[PDB]
Amino acid sequence: TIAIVDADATAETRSLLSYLDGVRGEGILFGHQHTTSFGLTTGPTDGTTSDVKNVTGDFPAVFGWDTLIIEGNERPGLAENTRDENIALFADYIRKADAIGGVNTVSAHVENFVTGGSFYDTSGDTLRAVLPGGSHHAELVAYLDDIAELADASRRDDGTLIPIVFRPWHENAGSWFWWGAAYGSPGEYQELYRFTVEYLRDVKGVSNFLYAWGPGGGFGGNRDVYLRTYPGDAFVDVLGLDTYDSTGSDAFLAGLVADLRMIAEIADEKGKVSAFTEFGVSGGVGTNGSSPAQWFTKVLAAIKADPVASRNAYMETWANFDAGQHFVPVPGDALLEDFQAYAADPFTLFASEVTGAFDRTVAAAPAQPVVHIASPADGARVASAPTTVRVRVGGTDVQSVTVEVAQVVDTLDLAYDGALWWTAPWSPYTVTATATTAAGTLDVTNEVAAA
Ligand SMILES: C[As](C)(=O)[O-]
């Protein structure tokens, strides 16, 4: 039996999670973003050819994708298409990847709902606007519905749902994305991530998703900084780390190993899976990138030389968009030889070396009882205006929920909305919710700031 975020996930999904954890320390799966949709040696793509396959002889073990496909911003998604047809093309590539024998993972560089800009547009205060009760919350819900559609469309010909590692709101420790650290307190981020899990799982019924959380990189092995944004054991299956470098220096490598063993330890302690969710040469390996000498093998060596840092299930590098920006070396790139050596190394696993990932029979541990206040989120700023307090109680039968605004200037009696939260209108420092449930009396406290 294993601790899995979706206690009622399909058998294949539970199996993948089991497989990923057992692979740790034994071998690491190599992954590549848009491996069959973007390539410099493949010619027009159709989801069946890859630069990785062409330069190493085998497809990557992990096929990474992104909701930008749905938006029609990245192939096979097309600008002219409706999100529904893009979704159809998206599922087709996942099915094909599954057929080839790889594991699928989906990240989400979500469009800025407020400005109409990209994921890089950090103006608009979009993170708070997208939180439950926010002005553009309905926009996020609709976006998540399309993802739920994608999850449902990802099925083998026999109808079996294809498992997918979903990794939303990544690299939030930095501020280059609108869901970054400068646009929302750690608490606001946690509610965004938590809502995303609950909405897809508890409201849409998605059951072939494994949830990954990777706040970024360069934590120097500091558990406290790494977990400051942590969504919680009940919301994460895979603990990630995103790190790029163009120096190849011993300092970089030392820092990397520190970070990699940190997540492996946290993972083992919690009985979860850890993985090098994103890695690569900064700026890529092409024209606008760099060619650190033997970067791939040096990084691999450092990883497998450490018994703890090697306990990570997979490592995915980025897409091969064009000559100026690509992460997997192709003929003409100085790092090609080194990358091929990295691929030939016994410790790195590719598609053909991944078998029986979805054939294991593991039981899902019962869902753990949790209670959290979706609004106002911890760390949020509350204006004098009228708001709604919403509390989420999952993994157990709830009879009642109460909230006390201390500083006890108020006491509210909530009512279930009949899908997700227990709410009550509130007209404005400490907000504590107490829910009388079958698992007993559960409470949680959020500290908010007044405007
Ligand atoms: C390649 As990225 C924007 O996920 O760091």
Range of the domain at 385: 368-451
Q: Is 318 in the pocket of ligand 1 (CB under 6 A)?
A: yes
Residues 134 and 183 in one domain: yes
Last residue of a domain, one of 367, 382, 410: 367
Report how far apart the first and last C-alpha atoms of the chain are (Å, whole number). 47
**Consecutive H or E run containing 165:** strand 164-167
The β-bridge relationship of strands 370-375 and 387-394 is: antiparallel
Q: Is 278 in the pocket of ligand 1 (CB under 6 A)?
A: yes
451 labelled binding-site residue: no
Residues 279 and 297 in one domain: yes
**3-class DSSP state for residue 274?**
strand
Of 347, 255, 301, 361, the C-alpha closest to 19 is: 361
171 counts as catalytic: yes
157 labelled binding-site residue: no
The β-bridge relationship of strands 209-213 and 242-245 is: unpaired
278 counts as catalytic: yes
* DSSP letters for 79-95: SSS-HHHHHHHHHHHHH
Q: How far is CA 48 from CA 68, 165, 278, 394, 451, in A?
A: 20, 20, 23, 41, 54
Distance separating alpha carbons of residues 187 and 232, to the nearest angstrom: 11
Of 174, 179, 168, the C-alpha closest to 212 is: 168
Rounded distance from Cα 300 to ligand 1 centre (Å): 21
Distance separating alpha carbons of residues 447 and 352, to the nearest angstrom: 50
Among the options 74, 111, 188, 278, which is catalytic?
278
Distance separating alpha carbons of residues 146 and 196, to the nearest angstrom: 13
Phi-psi region of 380 (alpha: psi -120 to 50; beta: other; left: phi over 0): beta
Residues 142 and 237 in one domain: yes
- Number of C-beta neighbours around residue 261 at 10 A: 20
Q: Is the dihedral of CA 48, 53, 59, 60 positive or negative?
A: negative
Of 12, 10, 4, 9, the C-alpha closest to 360 is: 12
Query: Residues 6 or more apart from 201 whose CB is under 8 A from it?
Result: 5, 6, 207, 209
Q: Is 339 in the pocket of ligand 1 (CB under 6 A)?
A: no
User: CATH number of the domain that 248 lies in?
Assistant: 3.20.20.80
Residues 301 and 253 in one domain: yes
Q: Is 26 exposed, middle or buried (0-12, 13-18, 19+ CB in 10 A)?
A: exposed
Do 336 and 40 form a contact (C-beta atoms < 8 A)?
A: no
Approach to solving: X-ray
Distance separating alpha carbons of residues 144 and 179, to the nearest angstrom: 15
Q: Return the ligand 1 atom nearest residue 119 CA.
A: 3
Rounded distance from Cα 318 to ligand 1 centre (Å): 7
Residues 330 and 412 in one domain: no
Resolution value (Å, 1 decimal)? 2.2
Residues 255 and 191 in one domain: yes
Q: Is the dihedral of CA 112, 116, 120, 124 positive or negative?
A: negative
CA 319 to chain centre: 17
Token code pair at residue 365:
């541990």
